[PDB]
Design an enzyme around this catalytic site. Structure first.
Site, PDB file in Angstrom:
ATOM      1  N   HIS A   1      -0.346  17.684 -28.145  1.00  0.00           N
ATOM      2  CA  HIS A   1       0.039  18.587 -27.057  1.00  0.00           C
ATOM      3  C   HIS A   1       1.385  19.249 -27.349  1.00  0.00           C
ATOM      4  CE1 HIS A   1      -1.900  19.388 -23.143  1.00  0.00           C
ATOM      5  NE2 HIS A   1      -0.709  19.823 -22.772  1.00  0.00           N
TER       6      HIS A   1
ATOM      7  N   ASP B   1      -5.054  15.636 -19.842  1.00  0.00           N
ATOM      8  CA  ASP B   1      -6.407  15.805 -19.334  1.00  0.00           C
ATOM      9  C   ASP B   1      -7.364  14.761 -19.881  1.00  0.00           C
ATOM     10  OD1 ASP B   1      -5.331  18.085 -18.159  1.00  0.00           O
ATOM     11  OD2 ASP B   1      -6.221  19.445 -19.664  1.00  0.00           O
TER      12      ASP B   1
ATOM     13  N   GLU C   1      19.247  -7.553   4.239  1.00  0.00           N
ATOM     14  CA  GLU C   1      18.734  -6.224   4.533  1.00  0.00           C
ATOM     15  C   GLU C   1      17.213  -6.286   4.518  1.00  0.00           C
ATOM     16  OE1 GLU C   1      18.940  -2.831   1.983  1.00  0.00           O
ATOM     17  OE2 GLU C   1      18.852  -4.026   0.145  1.00  0.00           O
TER      18      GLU C   1
ATOM     19  N   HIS D   1       9.003  22.144  10.675  1.00  0.00           N
ATOM     20  CA  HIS D   1       9.476  21.130  11.605  1.00  0.00           C
ATOM     21  C   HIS D   1      10.076  21.802  12.833  1.00  0.00           C
ATOM     22  CE1 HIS D   1      12.456  22.092   8.522  1.00  0.00           C
ATOM     23  NE2 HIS D   1      13.387  21.937   9.445  1.00  0.00           N
TER      24      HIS D   1
ATOM     25  N   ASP E   1      17.422  -9.541  -0.224  1.00  0.00           N
ATOM     26  CA  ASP E   1      16.611  -8.368   0.094  1.00  0.00           C
ATOM     27  C   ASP E   1      15.188  -8.826   0.379  1.00  0.00           C
ATOM     28  OD1 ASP E   1      15.689  -5.798   0.482  1.00  0.00           O
ATOM     29  OD2 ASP E   1      15.494  -5.360  -1.658  1.00  0.00           O
TER      30      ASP E   1
ATOM     31  N   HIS F   1      14.333  -4.776  -7.572  1.00  0.00           N
ATOM     32  CA  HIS F   1      14.489  -5.696  -6.450  1.00  0.00           C
ATOM     33  C   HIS F   1      15.796  -6.476  -6.567  1.00  0.00           C
ATOM     34  CE1 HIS F   1       9.912  -5.350  -6.283  1.00  0.00           C
ATOM     35  NE2 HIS F   1      10.316  -4.954  -5.089  1.00  0.00           N
TER      36      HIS F   1
END
Length: 1319
Positions: free
Chosen positions: A1252, A1283, A756, A824, A8, A965
């Site tokens: 949170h 934040d 490829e 489109h 690859d 990969h």
RNA sequence: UACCAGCAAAACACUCCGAUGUUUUAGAGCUAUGCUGU
RNA sequence: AACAGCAUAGCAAGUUAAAAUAAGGCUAGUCCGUUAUCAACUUGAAAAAGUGGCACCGAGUCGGUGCUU
DNA sequence: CTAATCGCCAATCGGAGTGTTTTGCTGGTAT
DNA sequence: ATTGGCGATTAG
């Protein structure tokens, strides 16, 4: 035994894997060299390699050109000093010496510190009388008495050093205060010429309309809209366009048979006029000349802004005006500010840090900032003419600014000529040197000569004629010109493919036209009523056809031949030709042009002297200058007359062919005895085309061509390829990896290789500005859009639409981009495809929602459609599909071709890579001279693997590891091998080397159907085997299990490339004087502490050295070892001699055996598994990476998106598994408390997560992906959880790695050497 | 896997010119008060 | 006392010019200096050549068992 | 009291000329 | 599009 390789390739990585016959990855134990205890290690065979990206060669060229220009400008002044240095020694001995030591302080000067007069009293009077240099220039131009010649030198030097631009060729004279007078004179002349059709002046100020800061076309349109009944093509419009400066077509204005266009900025205008003056002169005689004068008054209209007929120096008198308005405005502003607001005086005129008048003179502020800062103050106090001045950008102004780039050099030349003619009677040595002085200012090297070298440059091609210096007074007697232009063109033209030692013919050669005619008319196949089988025409019939058809007209239509050739000389009515599509693309045009020019046919028809014709044709297509062609055509001056020599001057061609003459009329058959032209003229009943004559094994063409083709290196080939250097770097690394892999496994070759290949602000802003300017809108200046918004697609589409809704013609709101949508033109399902998307709030206005938009939008705003096409705000694909909407619709064969194109690769880079690998791999022959093939090379696509993953639930997330990969490299080979084993009938498509539409659609849409189970109602056999041979292909109870096992291994090899840095020395800024030891001197005699200098250099590599040093005052001797950095500037001295270089630093008794070199990205191993990489002599980077189980990855992927009954099962699965976030957080914490070693950031992260803790799972699952940035490979960075922002952690020490293990790695990572640093 | 064709874009490799920007020095600064001194 | 430098308070002016623009080099030209190439060890100016045993059970960054040098 | 942290910082605009591949709709033709 | 230098204040 019987393995295969998958690869690859990409821009920044290369991934590799090796598989066996049952889809398994082997494992082996490797040796370890060094001096440690370990002597073996077990490894798997899969991995990836990472490196940095290459760059282009654009900056180096710019630096080179700048260097050359600086050197030449420095050389320009020495000639003037040489001329002047005979009388200056009688008025001041040391005038020139004092002018070079102006930069020094008053302790290294060696002379006095007033470098004009050398005295104190008469140094201030000069500045009191002459505040600027323009005062002196004007006085010298206008006065009449004798003057000191130092002043003359200063004025002349100022003129020579800065000398305007070279954009206009010709002669120029200043008379611009009469734009309307010259306009009315031209109008009067036009009325005199056309007494029947007079034209009114209408009293329109051409100055205002024709000086707008816009394009010339808009100005012409505005001018022509005032007068009705006249358009661009009108004669008056053409004349005014020529006056404005443009290229007008004059053919229609006098129904001329041939093109005739005149422009006012080229030398041709001095002669081209004569052509138009040929059949004219009683009228249209002065109507041109006056027009020229108009072009004088428009160009120099906004530049001078001063009166004339008073002084012969408009430029030097138009800059004394500025140094009166500045003076007049400063006093008024001071008085007003003191009178009305006395608290703000000290901030404007004394503070040197805030954009005031003090920050504008001796600060760092431009003019726009000063204008912005002072406007609000001016309106609060009240005194109003200054605002009017500001809005025109005519406030307090200086003399040397950024708008001076439009001053031609003719003005400077005129002022110099004026000065030199006034003082030539007092100084006789100025009488006989005027031309020599002007030649210094006017000279310029042409672009087809290049550097004036002698044989030590790889960029130069100049040819000499004598052996003297090339001073600008003998340039035409030492340099040969024509040969230089010939070599300039001939160094970069192409060669011949068949014969690699012959040049290509010009595209307009007579022989080329003969060849194409005799080729296009050799395969013409006609059928008549008498002969049912069509036959070939005879040679003499073809000759007659050429005589009566090819030598009569310009181009022949398809029907003209049928209606003329067979009608009179053949008396036949039926003929069909297929070999040509409705239009003869081959014609003898140059023959007709020549026959027109030289007007005799005996010379052209006779073939005894065609060489002269070839010579002249080659000459006309080579030289770009008139004088050179005129001088080169002189050899055959006696064969013709001067009348035709005048016309032959004005004829130019362009283009280069594709084959030589040794191939067409140079190589003769050893058996038949005829050249290719004879065969194309006469070949018998078997009339073959040149492509068919090439393919004749019996004939000797094969032998010669093959011998020539048979008659090096890898880097040369890769460099000679075409493309970006990033792909070339990838290809080279891939080749090296393949050789290493072949060596590792016993010097055996594989069976299959699968490959490829994977997949702005400045240009966006320039395009937006151009689109605004072309349409003349006012949206670009509305808001200063940031580069981030420019990159933003919503704002980009808003700007390209100009804030106007395409379907409804109303102004788009700037804050409604959230409610706006993207549409489109063509559906993605119809054709899966920036040129196809538009912005609109409502998509129902286009018409049908599942088809091409209806014709209503076009039929209702085609005017704005054409306007947008002109403004380039609508793309070529956009308007092409818009036109296709009216011109038809869509079919299904195009969709079939599109899906075939998206299933089959088409690019040429993949084919070049495949050819290189193939030619390297199998290189054996037999007795029959056919290469034995033993390795197959395959290329597929990028969508097969993605479809496989998404179908079978093997998901990928790109923000955790670097393992994807290698995983992609592994998944390529399995699919490729399975497909090629199942269908042995698809090599002719997929493998390198050498009704029906519905069938093809079904085949290429269900090629990947044998992998899956129940389809939709149709169960499948559990074992899938090849119907031809009985071999097992796919087993669904084992292959998925082995794939899932391989996809979750903990050990994968990942390596990073080590390089030596190279480039610029340091930063480019110059800083004020300072008391520090981090400043580098600009020259050898300039001390930084008193002159300033550079800072912050770059390092090349580090060196490890252990020796004795003195640290203290009592000269204590000790031992030490540490890292020292070598920079790009002193690398050469260090390499020349290391010991003396080190002893100069302070160290003594250095052992020349333990010096170790360390480049960037070197790998150090600590005690508990931690790894570090080296970034400089004082900085480190992380080198670890963590592995997560598969269930966590799948859950994170499913829970992020969170957007038909089947989908509900996953919908419930995500909700059912709630308690995985705690596990993920614990894994992160345990990994971070062993290798990263950061405390404050970890505590902050844990506290924020705890606090949170109450929001949807989608929202809490889209932030752990961000959190993963703490634990990565490379350079530390910053991120944001919800934040709260978390800053960077940096490792600024380097002492620990001095007692660790150093690893040396190979390219693939499998061979290693370990060294212990406790010696 | 090569030869004509019409076009419109894109990328890549060379040569020749223009205007600014940054660093030291020269364009004698005046009056009143206090400290240090040869 | 002057003179000079320092700290304070007031008022005056300001737009221009010379030199450098990668430190430098030898091949002495109106020429060259920021692109492409590069793990360790042995022989070789350099190019270049050479150097590392196999099966089986397993899996938190690779571990153990059987056979050979 | 000396190393380790915190915050800021990084040369930019315009012009003229020549040659070569590569898409992507064209066609033909032929091999 | 970042990622390594440099000056000024602060803990172990």
């Amino acid at each position: 035994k019987k393995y295969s390789i998958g690869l690859d390739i990409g821009t920044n990585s290369v991934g590799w894997a090796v598989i066996t016959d049952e889809y398994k990855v082997p494992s082996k134990k490797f040796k370890v060299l060094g001096n440690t205890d370990r002597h073996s290690i077990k490894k798997n065979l899969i991995g990836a390699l990472l490196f940095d990206s290459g760059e282009t060669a654009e900056a180096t060229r710019l630096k080179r050109t700048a260097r050359r220009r600086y050197t030449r400008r420095k050389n320009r002044i020495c000639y003037l000093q040489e001329i002047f240095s005979n009388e200056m020694a009688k008025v001041d001995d040391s005038f020139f010496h004092r002018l070079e030591e102006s930069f020094l302080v008053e302790e290294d000067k060696k002379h006095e510190r007033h470098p004009i007069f050398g005295n104190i009293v008469d140094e201030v009077a000069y500045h009191e009388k002459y505040p600027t240099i323009y005062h002196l220039r004007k006085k010298l131009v206008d006065s009449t008495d004798k003057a000191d010649l130092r002043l003359i030198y200063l004025a002349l030097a100022h003129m020579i050093k800065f000398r305007g631009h070279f954009l206009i060729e010709g002669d120029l004279n200043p008379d611009n205060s009469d734009v309307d007078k010259l306009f009315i004179q031209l109008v009067q002349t036009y009325n005199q010429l056309f007494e029947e059709n007079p034209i009114n002046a209408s009293g329109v100020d051409a100055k205002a309309i024709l000086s707008a800061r816009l394009s010339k076309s808009r100005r012409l349109e505005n001018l022509i809209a005032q007068l009705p009944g006249e358009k661009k093509n009108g004669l008056f419009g053409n004349l005014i366009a020529l006056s404005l400066g443009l290229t007008p077509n004059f053919k229609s204005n006098f129904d001329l048979a041939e093109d005739a266009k005149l422009q006012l900025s080229k030398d041709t205008y001095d002669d081209d006029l004569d052509n138009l003056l040929a059949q004219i002169g009683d009228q249209y005689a002065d109507l041109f000349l006056a027009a020229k004068n108009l072009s004088d008054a428009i160009l120099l209209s906004d530049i001078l802004r001063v009166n004339t007929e008073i002084t012969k120096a408009p430029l030097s008198a138009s800059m004394i005006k500025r140094y009166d308005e500045h003076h007049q405005d400063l006093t008024l502003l001071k008085a007003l500010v003191r009178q009305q607001l006395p608290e703000k005086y000290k901030e404007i005129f004394f503070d040197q840090s805030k954009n005031g008048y003090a920050g504008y003179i001796d600060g760092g502020a431009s003019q726009e900032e000063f204008y912005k800062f002072i406007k609000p103050i001016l309106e609060k106090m009240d005194t109003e003419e200054l605002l009017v001045k500001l809005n025109r950008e005519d406030l307090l102004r200086k003399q040397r600014t950024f708008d001076n780039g439009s001053i031609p050099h003719q003005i400077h030349l005129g002022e110099l000529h004026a000065i030199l003619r006034r003082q030539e009677d007092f100084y006789p040595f100025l009488k006989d040197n005027r031309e020599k002085i002007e030649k210094i200012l006017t000279f310029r090297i042409p672009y087809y000569v290049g550097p004036l070298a002698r044989g030590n440059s790889r960029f130069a091609w100049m040819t000499r004629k004598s052996e003297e210096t090339i001073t600008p007074w003998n340039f035409e007697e030492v340099v040969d010109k024509g040969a230089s232009a010939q070599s300039f063109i001939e160094r970069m033209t192409n060669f011949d493919k068949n014969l690699p030692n012959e040049k290509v013919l010009p595209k307009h050669s007579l022989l080329y036209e003969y060849f194409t005619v005799y080729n296009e008319l050799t395969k013409v196949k006609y059928v008549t009523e008498g002969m049912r089988k069509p036959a070939f025409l005879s040679g003499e019939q073809k000759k007659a056809i050429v005589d009566l058809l090819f030598k009569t007209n310009r181009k022949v239509t398809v029907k003209q031949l049928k209606e003329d050739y067979f009608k009179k000389i053949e008396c036949f009515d039926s003929v069909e030709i297929s070999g040509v599509e409705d239009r003869f693309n081959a014609s003898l045009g140059t023959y007709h042009d020549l026959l027109k020019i030289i007007k005799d046919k005996d010379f052209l028809d006779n073939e005894e002297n065609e060489d002269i014709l070839e010579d002249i044709v080659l000459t006309l297509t080579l030289f770009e200058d008139r004088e050179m062609i005129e001088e080169r055509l002189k050899t055959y001056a006696h064969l013709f007359d001067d009348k035709v020599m005048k016309q032959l001057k004005r004829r130019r061609y362009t283009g280069w062919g594709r084959l030589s003459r040794k191939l067409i009329n140079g190589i003769r058959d050893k058996q038949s005895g005829k050249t290719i032209l004879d065969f194309l003229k006469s070949d018998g009943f078997a009339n073959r085309n040149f492509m068919q004559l090439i393919h004749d094994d019996s004939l000797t063409f094969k032998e010669d061509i093959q011998k020539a083709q048979v008659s090096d290196s890898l880097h040369e080939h890769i460099a000679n390829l075409a493309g970006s250097p990033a792909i070339k770097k990838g290809i080279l690394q891939t080749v090296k990896v393949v050789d290493e892999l072949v060596k590792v496994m016993g010097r055996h070759k594989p069976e299959n290789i699968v490959i490829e290949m994977a997949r702005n602000s400045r240009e966006r802003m320039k395009r937006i500005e151009e689109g605004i300017k072309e349409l003349g809108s006012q949206i670009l200046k509305e808001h200063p859009v940031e580069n981030t918004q420019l990159q933003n697609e919503k704002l980009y589409l808003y700007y390209l639409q100009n804030g106007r809704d395409m379907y409804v013609d109303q102004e788009l709101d700037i804050n409604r981009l959230s409610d706006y949508d993207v549409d489109h033109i063509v559906p993605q399902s119809f054709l899966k495809d920036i040129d196809n998307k538009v912005l609109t709030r409502s998509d129902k206005n286009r018409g049908k929602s599942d088809n091409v938009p209806s014709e209503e939008v076009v039929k209702k705003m085609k005017n704005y459609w054409r306007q947008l096409l002109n403004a380039k705000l609508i793309t070529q694909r956009k308007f092409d599909n818009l036109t296709k909407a009216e011109r038809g619709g869509l079919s299904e064969l195009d969709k079939a071709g599109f899906i075939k194109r998206q299933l089959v690769e088409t690019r040429q880079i993949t084919k070049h890579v495949a050819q290189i690998l193939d030619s390297r791999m199998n290189t054996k022959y037999d007795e029959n001279d056919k290469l034995i093939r033993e390795v197959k090379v395959i290329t597929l696509k990028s969508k097969l693997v993605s479809d496989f993953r998404k179908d079978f639930q093997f998901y990928k997330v790109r923000e955790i590891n670097n393992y994807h990969h290698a995983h992609d490299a592994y998944l390529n080979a399995v699919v490729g091998t399975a497909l090629i084993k199942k269908y042995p009938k698809l090599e002719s498509e997929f493998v390198y080397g050498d009704g029906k539409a519905t069938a093809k659609y079904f085949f290429y849409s269900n090629i990947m159907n044998f992998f899956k189970t129940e389809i939709t109602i149709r169960k499948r056999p559990l074992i899938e085997t090849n119907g031809e041979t009985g071999e097992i292909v796919w087993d669904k109870g084992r292959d998925f299990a082995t794939v899932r096992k391989v996809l979750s291994m903990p050990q994968v090899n990942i390596v990073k490339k080590t390089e030596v840095q190279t480039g610029g020395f340091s930063k480019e800024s110059i800083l004020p004087k300072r008391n520090s030891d981090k400043l580098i001197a600009r020259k050898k005699d300039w001390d930084p502490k008193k002159y300033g200098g550079f800072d912050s250099p770059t390092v090349a590599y580090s060196v490890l050295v252990v020796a004795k040093v003195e640290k203290g005052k009592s000269k204590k001797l000790k031992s030490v070892k540490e890292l020292l950095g070598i920079t790009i500037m002193e690398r050469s001295s260090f390499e020349k001699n290391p010991i003396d270089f080190l002893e100069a630093k302070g160290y003594k008794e250095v052992k020349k055996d333990l010096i170790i070199k360390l480049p960037k990205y070197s790998l150090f191993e600590l005690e508990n598994g931690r790894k570090r990489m080296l970034a400089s002599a004082g900085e480190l980077q992380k080198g670890n990476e963590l592995a997560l189980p598969s269930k966590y990855v799948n859950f994170l992927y499913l829970a992020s998106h969170y957007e038909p009954e089947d989908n509900e099962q996953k919908q419930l699965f995500v909700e059912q598994h709630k308690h995985y976030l705690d596990e993920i957080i614990e894994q992160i914490s345990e990994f971070s408390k062993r290798v990263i070693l950061a405390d404050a950031n970890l505590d902050k992260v844990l506290s924020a997560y705890n606090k949170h803790r109450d929001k949807p799972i989608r929202e809490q699952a889209e932030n752990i992906i961000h959190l993963f940035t703490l634990t990565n490979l490379g350079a530390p960075a910053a991120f944001k959880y919800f934040d709260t922002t978390i800053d960077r952690k940096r490792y600024t020490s380097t002492k620990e790695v001095l007692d660790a293990t150093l690893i040396h790695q190979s390219i693939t990572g499998l061979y290693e050497t370990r060294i212990d640093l406790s010696q």
